Amino acid sequence: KKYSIGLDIGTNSVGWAVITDEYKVPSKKFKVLGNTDRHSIKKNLIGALLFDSGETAERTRLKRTARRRYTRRKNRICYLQEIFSNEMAKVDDSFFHRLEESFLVEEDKKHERHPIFGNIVDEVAYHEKYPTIYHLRKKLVDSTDKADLRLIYLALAHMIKFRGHFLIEGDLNPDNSDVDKLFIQLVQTYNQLFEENPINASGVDAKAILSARLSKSRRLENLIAQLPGEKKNGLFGNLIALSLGLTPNFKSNFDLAEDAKLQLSKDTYDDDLDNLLAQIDLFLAAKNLSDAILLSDILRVNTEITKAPLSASMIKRYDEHHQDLTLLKALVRQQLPEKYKEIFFDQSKNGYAGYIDGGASQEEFYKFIKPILEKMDGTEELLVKLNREDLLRKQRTFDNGSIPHQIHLGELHAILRRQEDFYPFLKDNREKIEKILTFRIPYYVGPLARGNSRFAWMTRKSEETITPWNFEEVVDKGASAQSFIERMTNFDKNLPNEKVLPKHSLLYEYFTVYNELTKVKYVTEGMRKPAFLSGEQKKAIVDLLFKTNRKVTVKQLKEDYFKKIECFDSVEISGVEDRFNASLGTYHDLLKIIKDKDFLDNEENEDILEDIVLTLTLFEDREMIEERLKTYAHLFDDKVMKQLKRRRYTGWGRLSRKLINGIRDKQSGKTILDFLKSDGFANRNFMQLIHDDSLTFKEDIQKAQDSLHEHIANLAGSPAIKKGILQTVKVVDELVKVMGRHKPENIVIEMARENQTTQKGQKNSRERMKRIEEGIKELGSQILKEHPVENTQLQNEKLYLYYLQNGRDMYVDQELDINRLSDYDVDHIVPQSFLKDDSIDNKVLTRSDKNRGKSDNVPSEEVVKKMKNYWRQLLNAKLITQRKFDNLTKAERGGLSELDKAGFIKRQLVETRQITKHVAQILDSRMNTKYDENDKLIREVKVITLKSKLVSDFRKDFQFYKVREINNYHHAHDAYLNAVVGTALIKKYPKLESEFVYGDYKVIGKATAKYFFYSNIMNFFKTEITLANGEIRKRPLIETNGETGEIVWDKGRDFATVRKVLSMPQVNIVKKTEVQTGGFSKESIRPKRNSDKLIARKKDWDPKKYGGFLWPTVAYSVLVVAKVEKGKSKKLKSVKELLGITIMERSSFEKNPIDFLEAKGYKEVKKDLIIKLPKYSLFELENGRKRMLASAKQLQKGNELALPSKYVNFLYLASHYEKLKGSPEDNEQKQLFVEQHKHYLDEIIEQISEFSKRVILADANLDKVLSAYNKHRDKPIREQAENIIHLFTLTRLGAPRAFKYFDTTIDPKQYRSTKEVLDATLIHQSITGLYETRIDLSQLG
RNA sequence: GACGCAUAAAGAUGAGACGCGUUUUAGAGCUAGAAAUAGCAAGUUAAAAUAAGGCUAGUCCGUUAUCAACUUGAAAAAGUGGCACCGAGUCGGUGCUU
DNA sequence: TTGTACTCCAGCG
DNA sequence: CTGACGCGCTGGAGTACAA
DNA sequence: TCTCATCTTTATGCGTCAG
Ligand SMILES: [Mg+2]
Ligand SMILES: [Mg+2]
Ligand SMILES: [Mg+2]
Ligand SMILES: [Mg+2]
């Protein structure tokens, strides 16, 4: 009759078990279907479902964004071809046609094989005249002659296609500001404006600063040494104020016009010209010098004047590459003649032939070639150029991500200015071409769809086609940027039909303070008991404290209000810690801006304040903010408007305006904030207003308030959790279907919450400012002195990593600049391609080029010996952890390896937590579907949420040990123990039912007391318990309910029962059969070959001539019974095989299976005999041997070894020999137990041998492992038992993997033959696997 | 075991961009050569594609989630499988029931 | 001409 | 004034032999 | 790799949600 459900939910696995009130697992004769002779199968009501983990949409999003970027780049090229087409038809009408056609082979080309000129001699002359594209670019920028229009198009097409980054907002003109000689007119301007006529003893320019590094600590001392110092902070020229602005908004030092705050001249210094622009040049020349130092950082040098410095630098790279190539060839011919064939001809040994023609990168070439220069003579210049990473460089290389788009814009503008006179159409539409370069769709606009994309949100003023020239007059940008945010913020939970407040709203902060404040109780010698603060007292302390301090402690309250106002000698205050958690930060910000306290304290003007904050939180683009905020121009002056629109806010709360201040009680007439301001002597906080039935907010909230799949689709978050939710819900209701539609008494779910100590929790959750402070104090730096910061700005991860590394890069030894974090790079230590780890222990802030070089690898050995001292210097300063140092020094230990990949990631933990919480929610809503007028919900099924510590202690205290390496039976065992502990706990203490059941509630540190309470609950299972004094205590061997004589736990029969079912051999292990979805093949593109296995990259691109993809992914296999035209004298041979349907043939096969099968060469196909066989399809063979269908040409292991529980306990006990950490008598008792039972090892190996000879059929590996055991049978028990722990990989269900013994490494035995399963018995297992449909495939065909 | 705030950690979702990488073609290889080839020279760049493709034809979409078998249903979705006892090598045996 | 067995391959910052 | 008890883990390509 | 935004689940501090 009555029964219970136990669940153990994981990311790749759900465990399930059915128990009775007697803790026994039921067993039934389940009916089986199919054409087989079997009609009934005894199955046990315990098992586990296994499935592949759900993938996140990160990779799909990246592929989609790459697709859109490629489409828009092609559209840019199409616009340029359209704007050139009519003039191009005059000079060579087939130029663009050949340009599209360059990929095709000569016999497939319609035009001549030479793309540009259409004839060989002119093409050779072009390549001799312009070896690279940068020759052509520099020639078109610098020369004044009329060039061929084809070269013009090639130049601007190369410029538009590869356009560079958009991280710089300013103009950054390279025509005149790129020159470093501007120091001399800077000091002329200094002499003119500063009326003292100083001597302009001009020394070296900023190149002397850039010789070592660009920083204040070199520039200031260098310029003070070069010219005599007359004013340290007021030298007025080439300052750090003009180049790399200060960290705070500090006032100007030795001001000329006014004292105003200073910053970097990128985007926040435009409002800092109010010294003169608000009262009506060194600052214009300061902008020029900052632009100059940016260009000299980005670009090396140009000796001869030019308007295209990037092409000049590329030309210098080409010339130095040619000179070094000639020198290297001469030296290698003269000194090592035998090595020339390897370096310059063998393209697989990472030589120069491997660096151009092969796949070797720049650093691999440097590391292979570096010993060659050291052993030969005359290679000193090559050695220093290699140490600077400047030897034999290419032009298209990984560090070209740093050059901004403004350099290409200036070069494009120079080309158009040179060529406008000869071609009038260039001058007619110059701005169109510059717009084709410079246009970029804003992130707040998104895709430009027309109602056919689920990712688009933009609205448009007109239905015209969107071009970069008419983007402003078609796309309504304001509503698009609004809907960029309103589509992403959540609704209010209590009021589901309207939006939440911003975090920095004055109403939200007011509600937060008045919610925290209204429960503060004060006591003194005056009266007997603490009393709540009255509304007048609350208003007085808010006006006296919270509007005068951004952050306030209780000490200031005690010594300033209660000492002075309503004077008392000493007051004790409860309800708050040392610091109030709420603060009126926005009030202080707007008081600092507006300079009108009365304006903020007014009640009538609260709505415009709210809309101002809503605007300032929604929008961030400058024109947009002033567009919305111009309505308030009749209250605010122009300067205070220019200051207020800078106050950027981000973050939104959880409640709505109607909730906190819109709805009113029908009797009292007060809002929720009105009650928090004053509620008489009740002083009710927010939860008390929303749950007291006296106030009328409650039923208003209830008036404010279907199949399973749509109940899943509407819940937000990652789609990966939906897989686990759906699988476990299907498990649950299938189990209810199994037991005759009867609901359980209770469902026990193993939830991943813990309990820990108050001190431990507070130590693990302290603010990161304390971390930075004690680390910097330990290493004794002064970085915090020069760059002040608070705890709030460390939320930004780049600034946090900058303070973590003590202002320096930790890959190379140079000082970082805090104001230029846009170009520095945050990289993962263990790369994203290998292991998913976004922890702070895996993140480095480094320079961009050094990250781009360190690609898809652990940082190499050389940088480890370079910076290993600084890594230890940060390690002992508690700024980086031991895991961070281990990952940083991973290259010393062999680098990337198979062992490094193996392991559990924290994303599994977070995903499991989200899953099991949602499972508890959905099962509670589904199982309890009935209610009455008086009781709001009937507890038909009590969902019980146990924590992992209780079940872990139950396993570790009664020798029910688990390891994951032998079998997947541990999930079912964990589910069973979950159910047993849950039902025994809910039966032993009926008045703790509200603690564990979902939706119910009960009423030294609090967490410490709760942790001890949870620890002391489990003791009633035990027979003898040792108290903390070391003295034992007894409990009855039969446990009872206490309030009733009903019996809850027999330490005899029930322990025998729980031992019986943990040795239970038949456990329903089901691998979910899934049709594969995703990319159809591996992304690597293989060269041309005569093989037929290459996949065509395009419809007209034959892979025999163009290459293509390989390694296709099969969606599912299909059993086909048909005739094959075999033989030269052809006859129709009837035959049955599997055929793999790939991803791109899935739609074609589903559209018409018959035509697709005759397209593959089959004929006379039986239509009704087509069986869809997905991945992990289960088949059954002789002697109970089961094979899982991995693919159409590869099988998998499908049998599970049911090892006895005594061997499992012995294997867990023999390993972890000296790390149990119990008591010495326990440790000794396990020691003698494993020493007198050392013969269990041979029994385990005999069991493994019998199981493998039965179902695995890897005889060679079996002889190998028996011989290797017989070699190492005299080893200590620890290493042995650890290696038989590894040994079950051979017998583990799944794919055959490579394990290892003591020294021998066993290669996997692959089942690359799906011929045997064609005469097998196909098993169609249900979600729980209890219902089966066995189809005998030998009767087919 | 839920909610508001403060401090954490570990993760998700969407948009806009950049730099490489891979492939085919173009960048006339020379000499000795019956040659299988050998010697020498050269190498840095460009185009096109970057999921096949799809139709509502947009500067849009196409790698997440869904998916045992059978009977209905375009699909959505609905429905289909006795119990008790004694045992255990992946489940077996015995006894009532329509 | 068809099955096997052993080793290598796999977009990324 | 409330209850008790001292979370994982490979299929396909390429080359080389048995018939 | 960069720049913008929005969330989620857990761990502590405080308050609260009931009869
Ligand atoms: Mg668990
Ligand atoms: Mg990196
Ligand atoms: Mg488990
Ligand atoms: Mg899928």
Contact A1241, A1275 (CB under 8 A): no
For strands A1194-1197 and A1186-1191, give the pairing: antiparallel
**Separation of A213 CA from ligand 2 center, angstroms?**
23
- A677: which 2 tokens? 């301001």
Angle (CA) A225 A228 A231, round 5°: 105
CA distance A214 to A567: 59
> Which is nearest to A798 in space by CA: A771, A775, A825, A816?
A825
What is the helix, strand, coil percentage profile of chain A, to 5? 45, 10, 40
Q: HEC string of A449-480?
A: CCCCCCCCCCCECCCCCCCCCCCCCCECHHHH
Cα A108 to Cα A94, A1086, A1094, A1157, distances in angstroms: 16, 21, 20, 31
Cα gap A529→A522, rounded to integer Å: 9
Q: How many CA atoms lie within 13 A of A1274 on its CB side?
A: 1
Distance A53 CA to ligand 4 centre (A): 9
Which residues have a Cβ under 8 Å from the Cβ of A550 and sit 6 or more positions away?
Answer: A583, A585, A588
Amino acid at A260: A
Contact at 8 Å (CB) between A1280 and A1238?
A: no
Residues A634 and A752 in one domain: no
Instruction: Report the Cα A529 to chain-centroid distance in Å.
Output: 53
Q: What is the dihedral of CA A179, A184, A189, A195, to 10 degrees?
A: 160
In chain A, positions 89-108 with C-beta closer than 7 Å to nucleic chain E are: none
Please give the Cα distance from A72 to A61 (Å, whole number): 16
Q: In angstroms, how far is B81 C1' from A1328 CA?
A: 14
| Residue whose token pair is 């492992």 | A1265
Rounded to whole angstroms, the distance from the CA of residue A1194 to the C1' of nucleotide D18 is 21
Cα maximum dimension of chain A: 115
Shared domain check, A515 and A648: yes
Query: Which strands form A531-532's sheet, in the order they lie side by side?
Result: A531-532, A521-523, A572-574
Residue A559 and residue A564: Cα distance in Å, rounded?
8
Structure tokens at A1058: 């729980």
Q: Where are the alpha helices (DSSP H) in A250-379?
A: 282-298, 309-335, 340-344, 352-356, 362-375
Q: In whole angstroms, what is the distance from residue A494 CA to residue A842 CA?
A: 40
| Residue A940 sits in the same domain as residue A1046 | yes
Q: Beta strands A1332-1336 and A27-33: pairing type?
A: parallel
Of A251, A270, A298, at which residue does a domain stop?
A298
* Nucleotides of chain E touched by protein CB (<7 A): 1-18
Q: CA A494 → CA A2, A508, A666, distances in Å?
A: 38, 16, 19
Experimental technique for the deposited model: cryo-EM
Does any domain span residue A986? yes
- How far apart CA A1325 and CA A1329 sit, in angstroms, is 5
DSSP letter string, A721-778: HHHHHHHHHHHHHHHHHHTTSPPPSEEEEEE------HHHHHHHT--HHHHHHHHHHH
Residue A62 located in a structural domain: no
Say how far apart CA A287 and CA A730 lie, in whole Å. Answer: 66
Whether CB of A821 is under 7 Å from strand E: the answer is yes
| C1'-nearest nucleotide to the CA of A59 | B63
Question: Nearest Cα to A1188, choosing from A1086, A1282, A1278, A1292?
Answer: A1292
Copy the structure tokens of residue A524.
Answer: 């003194």
Any binding-site annotation on A322? no
Partnered with residue A1323 across adjacent β-strands are: A1178, A1334
How many A from CA of A767 to the centre of ligand 2? 27
Q: How many domains does chain A have?
A: 4
CA of A103 to C1' of B36 (A): 34
Name residues whose C-beta falls within 8 Å of residue A797's C-beta, 6 or more positions apart in sequence. Answer: A826, A843
Q: Are A947 and A1274 in contact (CB under 8 A)?
A: no
The C-alpha atoms of residue A1166 and residue A744 are separated, in whole angstroms, by 47
CB neighbours (10 Å) of residue A814? 13
What pairs with residue A652 in β-bridges?
A: A502
> Tokens at residue A666, please?
């029908």
Q: Rounded distance, CA A967 to CA A501, Å?
A: 52
Same domain, residue pair A1058 and A916: yes
> Is A550 domain-assigned?
yes
Residues 6 or more apart whose Cβ sits within 8 Å of residue A607: none
Distance A669 CA to E6 C1' (A): 36
Name the residues in A377-416 having a C-beta closer than 7 Å to nucleic acid strand E: 401
Q: Cite the beta strand spans of A774-901 per DSSP E.
A: 825-828, 843-846
d(CA A802, CA A1292): 47
Nearest in space to A920 (alpha carbons), one of A941, A950, A945 = A945
In a domain, A120, yes or no: no
Instruction: For residues A371 and A373, give the distance between their C-alpha atoms in angstroms, rounded to a whole number.
Output: 6
DSSP, residue by residue, A929-981? ----SSSS---SSEEEEEEHHHHHHHHHHTT----SSS-THHHHHHHHHHHHH
| Chain CA centroid to CA A797, Å | 14
For residue A1251, what are the contacts with CB-CB under 8 A and spacing of at least 6? Answer: A1199, A1201, A1291
Domain end among A272, A298, A324 = A298
Look up residue A716 and give its two tokens: 């937000």
What tokens were used for A40?
Answer: 């009934």
Is A828 annotated as catalytic? yes
Q: In angstroms, what is the span from residue A1023 Cα to ligand 3's centroid?
A: 27
Strand pairing partners for A1195?
A1189
Identity at A1274, one-letter amino acid code:
D
Nucleotides of D under 7 A from a protein CB: 2-14
Region of residue A991 (phi > 0: left; psi between -120 and 50: alpha; otherwise: beta): alpha
Q: Contact at 8 Å (CB) between A721 and A54?
A: yes
CA distance A394 to A396: 6
- The number of angstroms, rounded, from the C-alpha of A658 to the middle of its chain's C-alpha atoms is 36
For helices A133-142 and A309-335, angle between their N-to-C axes, nearest 10 degrees? 140
Those residues whose C-beta lies under 8 Å from the C-beta of residue A453, and which sit 6 or more positions away, are: A447
Count CB-CB contacts under 10 A for residue A397: 14
Q: Do residues A38 and A22 touch, judged by C-beta distance below 8 A?
A: no
- The answer to whether A459 CB is within 7 Å of strand E is no
- The enclosing H or E element of A668 equals none
A1000: left (phi over 0), alpha (psi -120 to 50) or beta: beta
Q: Is the CB of A827 under 7 A from strand C?
A: yes
The alpha carbon of A925 and the centre of ligand 3 are apart by a number of angstroms equal to 25
Strand E, CB < 7 A, residues 596-655 of A: 617, 620, 648, 650-652
Asked if A1052 and A1044 touch (Cβ cutoff 8 Å), the reply is no
Strand B, CB < 7 A, residues 341-400 of A: 344-345, 347, 352-353, 356-357, 359, 394-400
Strand B contacted by A323 CB (< 7 A): no
The encoded tokens of residue A705 equal: 């308030």
Residue A1265 burial by Cβ neighbours in a 10 Å radius (0-12, 13-18, 19+)? buried
CA A42 to C1' B81 (Å) is 13
- d(CA A394, CA A313) in angstroms, rounded, equals 11
A581 within some domain: yes
The upper half-sphere exposure of residue A526, i.e. CA atoms within 13 Å in the direction of its Cβ, equals: 13
| DSSP category for residue A815 | B
Neighbours of A883 (CB within 10 A): 14
A512 domain residue, yes or no:
yes
Is A750 annotated to bind ligand?
Answer: yes
Q: Please give the Cα distance from A1094 to A1105 (Å, whole number).
A: 11
* Strand blocks (E) in A974-1067: 1024-1026, 1032-1034, 1038-1040, 1047-1050
Tokens coding A420 = 């406008």
CA of A1207 to C1' of B84 (A): 34
What separation, in Å, do the N-terminal and C-terminal C-alpha atoms of chain A show?
Answer: 46
Question: Choosing from A8, A272, A324, A823, which is the catalytic residue?
Answer: A8
Q: How far apart are CA A375 and CA A336, in angstroms?
A: 10
Which nucleotide is at minimal CA–C1' distance from A855? C13
Whether A1092 is in a domain gets the answer no
Active-site residue, selected from the candidate residues A413, A828, A918, A973:
A828
Nearest Cα to Cα of residue A960 among A1329, A1209, A711, A712: A1209
Q: A259 by DSSP, 3-state: which?
A: coil
Q: What is the CA radius of gyration of chain A?
A: 38
The resolution in angstroms reads 3.3
DSSP of A154-192: HHHHHHHHS--B----S---TTTTT-GGGHHHHHHHHHH
Rounded CA gap, A609 and A809, in Å? 44
Cα angle, residue A670 at apex, residues A669 and A676 outer, rounded to 5°? 165
**Does residue A544 lie within any of the structural domains?**
yes
Evaluate whether A799 touches A842 at the Cβ level (below 8 Å).
Answer: no
Q: Is A1207 helix (H, G, I), strand (E, B) or coil?
A: helix
Tell me if A127 is assigned to a ligand binding site.
Answer: no
User: Does at least one atom of strand C sit less than 7 Å from the CB of A854?
Assistant: yes
Domain identity same for A915 and A1030: yes
H/E segment holding residue A307: none
Last residue of a domain, one of A275, A298, A321: A298
Half-sphere exposure of A790 (CA within 13 A, CB side): 4
A531 touches strand E (CB under 7 A): no
Q: Is A647 helix (H, G, I), strand (E, B) or coil?
A: coil
**Tally of CA atoms within 13 A in the half-sphere of A1215 that contains its CB:** 18
**A644 and A751 together in one domain:** no
- A1274 among the known binding-site residues? no
Alpha-carbon distances of A51 from A55, A191, A935, rounded to whole Å: 12, 77, 40
Asked if A1202 and A1314 sit in the same domain, the reply is yes
Backbone discontinuities in chain A, residue before each (C to N > 2.5 A): 280, 705, 1003
Query: Helix (H, G, I), strand (E, B), or coil: what is residue A1038?
Result: strand
Range of the domain at A624: 506-653
User: Within this chain, do residues A512 and A614 fall inside the same structural domain, yes or no?
Assistant: yes
Ligand of minimum distance to the alpha carbon of A719: 4
As a whole number of angstroms, the distance between CA A416 and CA A426 comes to 7
Tokens 């007359």 locate to: A230
Q: How many residues does chain A have?
A: 1341
Distance from the CA of A1076 to the center of ligand 4, in angstroms?
6
Lookup: tokens for A1138: 């599997």
